Subunit: 503 residues, 4 copies
């Protein structure tokens, strides 16, 4: 909190975290004793911001019990009532938008120009579900012979959220917002690489007036996350991360019959037809590939450009990608920070390497970097890369890189690309730049993904649902649809007369 | 089909099945070669109705491929269009109500008095979802700055249903009805003990005008059901059965990220307050315990009666249970047939046995039986049993028996029973007989089950949703809610102007 | 009914009606005594099909009382139950599709090619609302401090429908379908020019199994219609006709605070941009102007064509309009029958006359006609007319003609036409033929009408709502929206504890 | 505004209004020149608070034009965007809750104990619809043969509200809240007796950030209100007042085909069964009759008590009514202020007078009053009256008094009272105090009113809809239902292929 207020004077390479990162029972837990720890880094400098001590069964359980208690109280409040508290929680995040954004940058690495949006996105989500709580309802149906039935929309109990690192504050908000609006209690575990901003949100909810313990936070990784999935008092698990893990999470959740939702990854296709408007199309390809160091799950990393315009398109886009400013993330003119960790950087580079080993032709970027500024010497920087000469069978076209690497591929006919676009086990997003009313919707209707952008890309409004198809997951975040994943319907049938018995 | 037309003259112990029970590609498959088989029995006589040859990977796959093809066509039809075919499929079942009902009895064992309802229930479900297909829709929202978004409600693909034996024709209908209304293709596997009536439904849909292959049927058990869960072209699994299995099904489904819904079992509580109306209450307890040989998942097998009325209640109910006619199921005055199999009978009896070994006091029934009629000598009959002197810790009060065995237990205060009622890992149904407006809803609101009957029991209207809480499963069957389990929403966001790019 | 069965051999100029046209209490009323009458004509021949005796207060009242009785019973049935009867009523209309269609032609005048669609449209509407009845519901909301509320969706009572003549059977169906699906009783008054097919529908509902008296029919005009609006036992009036009358109907309805819905007329604009596809655009203009002798309220009678394509468009469309076959309506190759009455014909011609007197330039049609066939000598025929050289101030561009008269006008820019298109007191429909995704929706969003077709026209699906804007009326027919105009919500709030009193 | 800030020291008989009461174009209009005026009074003292100059065509029109302009801008903002402004408008009313409440008392006359609730009710309504704006949407349906349709939920235009005096600030809020949430512009006319607090709300919206002119206010009466109904640029009229006027308003609205909603009066019945809980029942009768000097439209002024308990009920309730403190409204221990005007007081007394002249038996109250405090000597006070010995035919049982007068009547059987309860031309509200689950809902289902309270009364939550039945009006305020009265659906059908033309 004070660290958040210190931000106005904070700058790259200067900050250092010192608070405790575990939070339950309405306060930060000291987590005493040795307890193996992990270093969390400042992506732009490679500096160690602090250590993070992971939670074991003992801790986790307390977190849960804490939530459990609070739920009992919070679930008794009416929507109109849970609404008030939430509206305030937002108003607060609103008033600390910047400071929080700035801190978000230091641990995550994305540019503040982005970070700021990330947070507005966070408080809007809350303010949205808040206004949606008084709407929560069930039905009343008149049945044959005077009897009638009615459903009650009830909360699930204690909801566990397992977060990812590309949008720390935003994703946590996206899971708590609907969860609480519905009357549930929450316990979430931020990515060990980005444990700091999460707890902030938690404190804010308490500060807003939430019953002590409603929002808890446990730090840690695999071991921890597992404890959450196995804990018998968690009614729901909301996971966001890689497909491989999503698969494990779902399995463990089965042992208890837990409700589950998975927003896994993707290798989404962007389709460019010759009748489009190059500039907007260039922007799309661009916006669809390099936000947050290209570490965005919904990125159209597999760009299909209709052969006729391949040249002029590929020209302007290589220029534009080279014109991207890599450097201090806390700078407003910077357009790309460092990746999340060294391992990730090496992994992303390793991909570009094998790309050319498979025939790929690198038009720009794809190599380590070293900013002029001396303090960024140890940052995890690389230059945005644009591949050319790609084949549907190349590892880079098939695998989710999760780095700033764009694969451009030519195509000739509509029927052609559709079969190629949908030819993946993934199905998160997709896009299309064209001008013909029919082709637009038609292609939209035919792509097998959960989201399809038409003449734009990477927009993620709170008013609409968001989730995957196929192995990109199921369930939704944002939009009204979501409330059904954090509530259940009890059917109450009421006989107005006498029982019809066969005995 | 002809077997269905032969029914008017059919009678207990006379029939014998001879058709092939596997169905895909729009016809019955001969399933040649030895291929280990299983005997399906006529519960009322112990006779072997026929053998059933289970499907292996080869067969299953063909089933799926068949569905797969048909889906492509059926999913292209509009709701209003899929509606027409379905309305006819019902009209047909309607016109063969009896014959089908009669055959249902022979393999299942329940009395025709019940069987008939089971089928009306089947065609109503179809006729309901049919009228609901033209309603299937998504949203259109206006977004900031001229852009707008819209969701399309799309079918899942190929839906696999794994059925149970207590309501063969009804449950299959309950899974296909919504599935098809939504544009999906179906492949279901009836319980190996009751493979016959299922395929009938399948043929009817084809006869109604469904694209060849839309509804397929594969016979078999564990091995088979597994193949369905692992098959890469099945988008959804809809399971109904025991908790133990539900758990395995969910695990296998995870390997592919399949959509899943489980309508598992239960040990639901029936609450009787002293201010109720004994007769109706007696009927409830009765209706809540002995339909279909008491092999009903939603049965209030754990009856709590408020101490003051314990005597007079327990008196009239023991008399009534003894007054139940056990015999030929195809007889209209019969009120209980034989159980599904010998093993089940021995299992149900074994429970009563250990009950008294734990202190239970048998007031009636609980032993094998032997009807006067000579042809029913080998049937699987036992007499409806009513336990007395039960404790919350006795195995019979905790375990789902799935036989005609009622456990009566006394209670004193409201707060008392609630804690006791909800003290289970189950949460399917529950009931309450009282007269005070406040207690009714209040108790309703507090029970932790998916369904709560007030002054009645065992009613299951199509207009309302039905499913479990906790480990009784998740997802719903019937009611509007269900459509969300057989459809998904694709978000299509459309930019009306130019892209806002940070590059 | 028998007259309906006689149709297979019926032919233009041969038929003659002889049944009684008033219907209530579940049978046709003899309407004895002189009682001034009106001749109903066969538009294609000018022959008198029969006389029609109008209802006075006495009769009307009986109709109402009849409905009133039946409602009491019908409103007690559950949706699922009202559904069954309706599904049958359709199945019947389905099975007499042709014969009914044929008879529809004889009194109305439209070609059977159209008539047939009109009827399928009728039974689909019923079959649609039928499947929608089991869906009818209210809400259940949890309120602060334990209390809860719930709404019941209840029928209105006795609904009065006042029909128009351009689609006799279809419009009556469109009013009864939702009315009954909701539990209401209906009393409608067909247009005195087309009283015959209406009563047919009525009988069918009875034949389907509707409670005696639920659907009644009273013949007559102004006087009669008024009695309906003033009658104290009619809860709702559903009017379709001219604006002038809609206005009177609404006034009379006020004296009792009756629910009202008005589907008045219109002078809807069709917009053709230079980037469209001429053929489809020509078809649109065509389909938007000459169905049912151009006596369609939703016709885009004010066609705006972007200047560049004005010539080639105007050429092909004048040719096509001249290629329309006017003659025997009961002939399949006929594309236009005679108008509804002599007065209407003279009125439509009078408009074309004054058109040229104001500067209009007639490119074709616009004059009386006389088919070769001798029996059609006295029919009410005229040739489809296409005006050219029109001004926004000409009477023909401003007034609803309600005859086959198309006004083509040039335009230059988008902003231009929008201001011109929306510059009317009307607001029923509108259309736009263009190819640019943005312009399409954008223009759609900006037109001030209740319906907007994009690259087509005159389609009226049952799945979606239909009604006007401005002075074209309010309320909707078809689609789910409608149910809210035939039902009301009672709020039932239930206190679970004690009253909070300030006394 | 400053007057609002002066309130902390304000006291009965001290204040005096001096601001201008007309408001449009975002500021208070000086309304110069003589222009006949009307005195607005302080009910508790009879003092003249100020004069009110009514608006003529000239003024009104400017108001409208003002709204008209602002609408153009406000309607272009997205729900999420209109939401922000509204949330603030509330937060403001929230922060001035008291001062506003206090001022409300001075002109209206109700006690501050009530006034305070009135205002919380006002800001909640806004905060509710605000959170509901981002939810505003239409549908997307897939049609036969590739085509698809979609509806846009669009604002109406300029909405006119004609208010009543019993809840000045609350009712204005109840009309603006939904109106704006939907994108409309508003112009309302407060009751000439209570013109002051209205404009406050208006200013607040502007202060919140609403486009200049979106919320306007014109003072005046009949003449003025008429101008609103006739004005050609008002798309909707939302009226609240007497039945007689509601009827005139609807007639004038017809001349333009304006959308209309009427929340007229009522003579609602309260039913007390012998199995109830007297105390709560007494409170109900009480709360249902004497809030805001009994000048509440939803009051159960016609109390039916089951004969057996008539005595003990009637005893405790006469005592309680006598125990009501009449005096200074700005006092917290006061439970009833003075009525709205002298004429109203004389009218209410005149009713009690004729009551006894018809046989009524006055058990208490019913006469003028004169508080001890000297400053209240000229107030419009009378004592709460409780009639006894009433007949269904007495003028007092049939007419809406709109004063603190309770008519108690005995009854014997359920079927009896229902016929008697529903035997009225009114149908706004009704209540029932009983304990039997079946009777409760059953009676609820059978009463013919728009609202039915069960074991409580006068609760009016924002989460649920509120409106009348029969001649008590139509349309709803509060709850989700309302949004449909401030928005309309445009159907946009889009052809994906070629036109099917018959020419």
């Amino acid at each position: 909190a004070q660290l958040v207020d210190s931000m106005p004077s904070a700058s790259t390479g200067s900050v250092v975290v010192t608070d405790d990162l575990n939070y339950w029972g309405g306060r930060r837990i000291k987590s005493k004793d040795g307890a193996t720890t992990e270093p969390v880094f400042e992506p732009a400098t490679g500096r160690v911001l602090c250590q993070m001590v992971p939670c074991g069964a003992e801790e986790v359980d307390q977190a849960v019990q804490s939530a459990q208690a609070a739920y009992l109280k919070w679930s008794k409040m009416a929507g109109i009532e849970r609404s008030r508290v939430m509206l305030e929680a937002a108003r607060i995040i609103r008033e600390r938008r910047d400071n929080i954004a700035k801190l978000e940058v230091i641990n995550n690495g994305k540019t503040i120009t982005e970070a700021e949006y990330d947070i507005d996105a966070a408080w809007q989500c809350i303010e949205y579900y808040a206004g949606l709580a008084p709407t929560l309802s069930g039905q009343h149906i008149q049945l044959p012979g005077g009897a009638f039935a009615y459903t009650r929309r009830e909360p699930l109990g204690v909801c566990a959220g397992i977060l990812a690192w590309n949008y720390p504050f935003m994703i946590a908000a996206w899971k708590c917002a609907p969860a609480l609006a519905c009357g549930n209690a929450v316990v979430f575990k931020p990515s060990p690489m980005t444990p700091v901003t999460g707890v902030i949100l938690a404190e804010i909810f308490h500060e807003a007036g939430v019953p002590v313990g409603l929002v808890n936070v446990v730090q840690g990784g695999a071991e921890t996350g597992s404890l959450l999935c196995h804990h018998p008092n968690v009614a729901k698990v909301s996971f966001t991360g890689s497909v491989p893990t999503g698969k494990k999470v779902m399995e463990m959740s089965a042992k208890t019959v837990k409700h589950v939702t998975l927003e896994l990854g993707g290798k989404s296709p962007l389709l460019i037809f010759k009748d489009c408007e190059l500039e907007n199309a260039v922007r799309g390809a661009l916006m669809a590939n390099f936000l947050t160091q290209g570490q965005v799950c919904t990125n159209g990393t597999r760009v299909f450009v209709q052969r006729e315009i391949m040249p002029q398109f590929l020209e302007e886009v290589v220029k534009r990608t080279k014109a991207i400013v890599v450097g201090d993330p806390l700078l407003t003119e910077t357009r790309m920070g460092g990746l999340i960790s060294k391992p990730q950087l090496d992994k992303v580079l390793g991909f570009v390497a094998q790309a050319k080993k498979e025939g790929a032709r690198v038009l720009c970027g794809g190599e380590p970097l070293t900013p002029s500024d001396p303090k960024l010497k140890n940052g995890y920087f690389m230059s945005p890369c644009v591949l050319d000469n790609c084949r549907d069978d190349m590892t880079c076209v098939k695998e989710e890189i999760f780095g700033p690497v764009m694969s451009v591929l030519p195509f000739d006919t509509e029927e052609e690309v559709l079969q190629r676009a949908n030819n993946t086990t993934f199905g998160l997003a997709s896009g299309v730049f064209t001008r013909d009313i029919s082709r637009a919707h038609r292609v939209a209707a035919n792509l097998e993904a959960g989201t399809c952008y038409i003449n734009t890309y990477s927009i993620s409004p709170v008013e609409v649902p968001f989730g995957g198809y196929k192995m990109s997951g199921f369930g939704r975040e944002n939009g009204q649809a979501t409330v059904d994943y954090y509530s259940q319907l009890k059917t109450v049938i009421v006989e107005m007369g006498d029982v019809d018995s066969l005995f």
